Design a protein around this nucleic acid. Sequence first.
DNA 1: GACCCGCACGTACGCAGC
DNA 2: GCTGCGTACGTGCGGGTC
Lengths: 286, 226
Amino acid sequence: ELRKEKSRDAARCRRSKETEVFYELAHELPLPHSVSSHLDKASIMRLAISFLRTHKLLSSVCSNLYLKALEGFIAVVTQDGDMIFLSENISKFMGLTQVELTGHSIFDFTHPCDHEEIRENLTLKTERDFFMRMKKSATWKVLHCTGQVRSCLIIMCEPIQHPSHMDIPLDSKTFLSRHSMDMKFTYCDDRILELIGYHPEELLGRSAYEFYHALDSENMTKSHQNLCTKGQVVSGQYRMLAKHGGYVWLETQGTVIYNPRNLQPQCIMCVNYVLSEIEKNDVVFS
Amino acid sequence: EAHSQIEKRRRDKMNSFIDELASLVPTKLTVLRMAVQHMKTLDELKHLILRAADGFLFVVGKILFVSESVFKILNYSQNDLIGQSLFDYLHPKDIAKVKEQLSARRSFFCRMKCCTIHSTGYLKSSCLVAIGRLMEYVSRHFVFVDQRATAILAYLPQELLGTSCYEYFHQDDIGHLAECHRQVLQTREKITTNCYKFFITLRSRWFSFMNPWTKEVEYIVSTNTV
DNA sequence: GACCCGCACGTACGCAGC
DNA sequence: GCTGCGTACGTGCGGGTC
């Protein structure tokens, strides 16, 4: 009859003291007052640990307008699949803010059975480049990644737009084209004659896998199957011949459409960047 | 009845995070007390974003301002470009390009002068702000004509293209080459070599290549050596 | 007019000594 | 040989979001 009272009184006091210590540790945080002091208890711990790590491993390799005038955001991860820091512009290119995504697992936001490559990239072996797809009623989204690895990895992120609505002034050396599912030409814009000079009557069912040169084919095959498996692609460096021989350099960022009535990938198209002028004028190869 | 599992798991995460902090500090309400103490002694971005995508900041209009070490990627000093025109620093094709591209976002390349620079930016005051960022032959069927092969085997491309390999090949060892051709036809991946000739010993490596959609092999691409 | 989750309220015990 | 600190687990009670 006497044990319960002592136990409950001591327990009540200890409960109160623990929650109060928790909240005070929460108070001093990089976040402002309003949106930090009224959060759930689970996020406080991971947010504080994330701040500690991003202020600790920052000095491991250490010694006003860089975030803006920059397309995308800066992320960073470790080998356990957990981002630490995110840039403030994250709230305009994938839809969410920093506070919910600052210590959670990338595995719970990426596409499952599309992560063995990421788990291989994150481990040790200085220069790593790859591709990665990432995010309620969440629709999936595409993404491009570059950077250097410490063990951590600091990454750059530049998503591709959709040429259905293009908010950029395409230049006079940026011609448009459309292709078919098996890398076969269908249509060329009327911007080509001044740049490299073909006629559309030849730009037809001829296979596109003929103009690439030397190792360009054995790398754009990987780029094409990357577009087949993913939604988009950004190609590194390749050429495409002209009407009188020689190579002219072009780069692309492809896309894939879907159908309101169906589920297959219907149509693909590219955007072209004329880089160098016509080269090796006289000599021909085909 | 069966929320015990979800609450057990969340308890497990709770105790793991409250228990592992000892590593991140250089040393359990005592632990939280010393940690909230430790928080009190609490341009960091350069130290990663300089290492993240290379490049350096320049501003356009003249040109008004750059980073400290721009000669790392462009090879120019700091006072030899201020008070100095960007137009009298560039190639003329890119001159017409940037004249067309002077006046929200800007995805554009350059062919700048001491170097193909992919750079992005936005307008400000008029003026501009933008970060910058930097004895063999090869042919295949032979539909394709290489570069040094016509000096190698002494034959102009007015006599080779658009014909089969063994049409002109001397069939003194056409059999072992035939056996190799059968094996490399469906081998994919890496194919090694055995001897072949023309008078001129060429030791072919072939790579079975294939459209990753139509699922039917069409072309190969050689890296023929001697 | 409610379903799922986070926080709080209950106890049945490993341990050190007078 | 038997009593207060630290601990583990079950149960309810009440706040959003569709």
